[PDB]
Amino acid sequence: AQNPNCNIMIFHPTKEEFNDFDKYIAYMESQGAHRAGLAKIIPPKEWKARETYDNISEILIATPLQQVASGRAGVFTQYHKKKKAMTVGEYRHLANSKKYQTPPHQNFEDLERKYWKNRIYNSPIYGADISGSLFDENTKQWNLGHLGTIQDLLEKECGVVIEGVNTPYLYFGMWKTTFAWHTEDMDLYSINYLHLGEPKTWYVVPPEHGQRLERLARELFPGSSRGCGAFLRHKVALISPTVLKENGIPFNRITQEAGEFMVTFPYGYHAGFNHGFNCAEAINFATPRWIDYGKMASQCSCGEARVTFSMDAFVRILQPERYDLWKRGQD
């Protein structure tokens, strides 16, 4: 079995190997990459996402989110307080202000220590989940707006045509902005490209061990767990690496830098934080191997998770027994 310790793997495809996206995902899996839940892909030196980032300041962040924490430094939840709209230029200035800017630090490990010590005492503002793309239309390789759609994959595997669309999303971050522990909708893959700015640190649990994280989470957030049998779908809970290690949960960590892709694999729980002002693009995708994970994915039906239009067909076709309860939670 390849990669039996479930380490995060880093790949360096050549320009020729960068042509066929599906083929390269399958190659990474042949080497055991999915066992980690997360892989890094460094593009060939000949590749670029677009020419420059000099002209992005007028993009609007209609609903910036202030991420307010509750709990203790290593075990906390966050809620999202909606703020007034602002442009990317305005948000960048805000990220760089004395109130929000990254502190002086020695290296990524020192900054990680500072994150986990001090995150809860601040409320950073995240420009997350903005429909759009920064890939040039002429970029033909690993262009996240030109991937095969998940509806097409389901139709190809299973023969049923379904409604829905699959488009990318932009994330504008600042120091301490946080993504809570989660797997993707319907335990899909995700791919994330860091277009510009400061790094993003990731934590990940191997898919074969995801239920160990779920059991810890129920212990640590007992009110939330009574509320909902799949409350990590709410995407509000944080648990630090120190707490994971104290509880024997298998995990890994890695830092993504500008110009690098990350892929998350089906049922790979992940969480993390931004180092300073940055912009990432991400989208969900599927392969043949995903279908079995989609059929078995948990679902939140308590009302909290609320999701896109396109999840309806995935539940309806892959999980008909659960569909009526899930859709009530949508309503």
Ligand X SMILES: O=C(O)CNC(=O)C(=O)O
Binding-site residues, in ranges, read 126, 182, 184, 192, 200, 228, 234-235, 270, 300, 302
3-state secondary structure 120-184: HHCCCEEEEEEECCCCCCCCCCCCCCCCCCHHHHHHHHHCCCCCCCCCCEEEEECCCCEEEEECC
Contacting ligand X (CB under 6 A), which of 65, 95, 154, 280? 280
**Could you tell me which residues are annotated as the binding site for Fe cation?**
182, 184, 270
Q: Segment 208-247, which members bind Zn ion (CB under 5 A)?
A: 228
CA quadruple 159, 163, 168, 169: dihedral sign: negative
d(CA 269, CA 207): 7
User: 279: which strand partners?
Assistant: 172, 196
Residue 116 in contact with residue 153, Cβ under 8 Å?
A: no
Contacting ligand X (CB under 6 A), which of 192, 240, 256, 287? 192
Token pair belonging to 256: 């993504």
Q: Segment 29-88, which members bind Mg ion (CB under 5 A)?
A: 56, 58-59
* Residue 307 engages Zn ion in binding (rule: CB under 5 A): no
d(CA 224, CA 204): 22
Closest CB to ligand X among residues 6, 188: 188
* Residue 69 engages Zn ion in binding (rule: CB under 5 A): no
Contacting Zn ion (CB under 5 A), which of 300, 311, 313, 318? 300
Residue count, binding to Mg ion (CB under 5 A): 3
Q: Which does 46 bind (CB under 5 to 8 A by kind): Ni ion, Mg ion, Zn ion, none?
A: none
User: 42: which strand partners?
Assistant: none
Residues that bind Zn ion (CB under 5 A): 228, 300, 302, 304
Residues that bind ligand X (CB under 6 A): 128, 171, 179, 190, 192, 264, 270, 280, 282
